[PDB]
Design a protein around this ligand. Structure first.
Ligand SMILES: *[C@@H]1O[C@H](CO)[C@@H](O)[C@H](O)[C@H]1NC(C)=O
Lengths: 51, 51
């Protein structure tokens, strides 16, 4: 994930600290997290999407 | 005593239009080429056009 080729806009990783801790939590979601996530067999509508 | 005349001859009266502009539209095709190179230096550090 090095620079010089990778592109990110802003606000993709958060920072939190209370007393000289600086703990980092994750905000990136996996591929199986957004809505309308289908699989290899798909029958949305009259079309039967195969592989 | 007398003089000559000037005859006007009309053959056809067609329905035409004026000439607002004149140009030529040629036929075109799709031609393209590319080249594969390596960075090998500081010319291709992050992106091709700097700004
Ligand atoms: C999922 O699909 C439905 C129906 O096509 C649509 O209403 C909904 O907005 C979609 N969800 C997203 C996150 O786009």
């Amino acid at each position: 994930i090095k620079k010089d080729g990778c592109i990110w806009n802003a606000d993709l990783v958060g920072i939190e600290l209370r007393v000289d801790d600086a703990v980092c939590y994750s905000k990136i979601t996996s591929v199986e997290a957004v809505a309308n996530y289908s699989a290899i067999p798909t029958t949305i509508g009259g079309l039967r999407f195969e592989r | 005593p007398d003089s000559k005349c000037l005859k006007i001859k009309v053959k056809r009266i067609n329905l035409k239009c004026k000439k607002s502009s004149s140009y030529f539209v040629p036929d075109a095709r799709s031609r393209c080429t590319s080249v594969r190179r390596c960075r090998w230096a500081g010319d291709c550090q992050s992106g091709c056009p700097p700004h």
